[PDB]
Design a protein around this ligand. Structure first.
Ligand SMILES: [Ca+2]
Ligand SMILES: [Ca+2]
Ligand SMILES: [Ca+2]
Ligand SMILES: [Ca+2]
Length: 385
């Protein structure tokens, strides 16, 4: 087992304990609708991550009865691409969205393929823009395919920052979760979707959208206002990467999986998760272990099977680690907090994980760029590439 593999297991253990990557939906009885919260992580060019914290409210347009759900989440897989024959400033989007997080007439409008139209008018720090999108949704699979054009010329913000704003009625709700689909229940009259999106260390978007059928088209009409942005920051300075899977990356995912799946049955149970977390000096309760599993447990059986684990690792490719998360993983090895992983510290962790003085020294010696016999933060980072 390499230093890289053990560090990777340590990061995934902390991710399973703490990372919240889903779209969390709650009933809002006062508004006869829902609230949601989630965050997005945008990759900054030449390294680092820009966090976008989303707060959402949805309220029905009509007086008809709607479904108010139990707490649950949407799990989003999105791919951004370019149309090689498109000269206009554009974004091609493919998304698969599935509801989970509940353990084991409007819906009728979504059993086939539904044309979509999106229209956005934006104003960020007084830079105005418009976007038009079209494509189709196939809620049977939770599938969206859209192409968007900036109709005003050059988009003054990165396309990725508009993805969440630019139709959750296309989400796939599993059969055991159909009563919890507010979005389809509000159709065809539709819903108002409002957000505030906080770009950490930068300004915020405020959005208001009407999502409803106009004939047999699902239309999303949006207004967006951004205030308090930095003209040279990551958004108005265009410093976010547009978009982002090797056999090697998959094999690394599997090596991590097999450290949790100690009985080799192809699933990770609360007991198995607990065993690893206790070995890294955490002490989660049964209820907390069940909540960790729930974040990843697509089928709601109460375990993480192998494909569930690989889906989570694939989705985590859009959630680049923050300094604070990497410092936390470093800290599991750097138990005395002095900024240096000693051979003693690496042996303590390796031992606790059930993996010779020469083998430990050898591991240090590989990561130890500066030759001091210890691993500092910068060397830890470099070792994980
Ligand atoms: Ca197992
Ligand atoms: Ca499962
Ligand atoms: Ca230390
Ligand atoms: Ca060193």
């Amino acid at each position: 087992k390499t230093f890289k593999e053990v560090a990777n297991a340590v990061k995934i253990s902390a991710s399973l304990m703490g990372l919240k990557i889903n779209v969390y939906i709650k009933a809002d009885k006062q508004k006869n609708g829902i609230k949601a919260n989630f965050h997005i992580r945008h990759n900054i060019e030449d390294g680092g991550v820009q966090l976008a914290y989303h707060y959402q409210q949805n309220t029905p347009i009509g007086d008809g009865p709607v479904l108010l759900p139990d707490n649950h989440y949407l799990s989003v897989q999105s791919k951004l691409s370019k149309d090689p024959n498109e000269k206009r400033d554009h974004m091609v989007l493919l998304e698969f969205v599935t509801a989970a997080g509940i353990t084991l007439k409007g819906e009728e409008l979504f059993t086939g393929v539904v044309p979509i139209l999106v229209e956005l008018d934006g104003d960020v720090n007084g830079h105005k823009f418009s976007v038009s999108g079209e494509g189709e949704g196939d809620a049977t699979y939770g599938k969206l395919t859209l192409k968007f054009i900036c109709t005003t010329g050059k988009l003054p913000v990165p396309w990725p920052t508009l993805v969440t704003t630019l139709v959750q009625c296309f989400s796939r709700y599993p059969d055991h979760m159909k009563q919890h689909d507010f979005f389809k229940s509000a159709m065809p009259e539709g819903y108002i979707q409002e957000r505030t999106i906080f770009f950490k260390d930068d300004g915020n978007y405020k959005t208001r959208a009407e999502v409803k059928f106009e004939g047999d088209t699902l239309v999303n009409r949006i207004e967006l206002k951004g205030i308090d942005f930095k003209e040279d920051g990551n958004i108005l300075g265009h410093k976010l990467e547009y978009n982002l899977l090797t056999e090697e990356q998959i094999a690394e995912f599997k090596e991590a999986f097999s450290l949790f799946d100690k009985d080799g049955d192809g699933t990770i149970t609360t007991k198995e998760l607990g065993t690893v977390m206790r070995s890294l000096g955490q002490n989660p309760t049964e209820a907390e272990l069940q909540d960790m599993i729930n974040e990843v447990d697509a089928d709601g059986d109460g375990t993480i099977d192998f494909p569930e684990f690989l889906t989570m690792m694939a989705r985590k490719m859009k959630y680049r680690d923050t300094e604070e998360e990497i410092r936390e993983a470093f800290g599991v090895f750097d138990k005395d907090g002095n900024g240096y992983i000693s051979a003693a510290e690496l042996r303590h962790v390796m031992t606790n994980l059930g993996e010779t003085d020469e083998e430990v020294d050898e591991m240090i010696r590989e990561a130890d760029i500066d030759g001091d016999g210890q691993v500092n933060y910068e060397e830890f980072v470099q070792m994980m590439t």
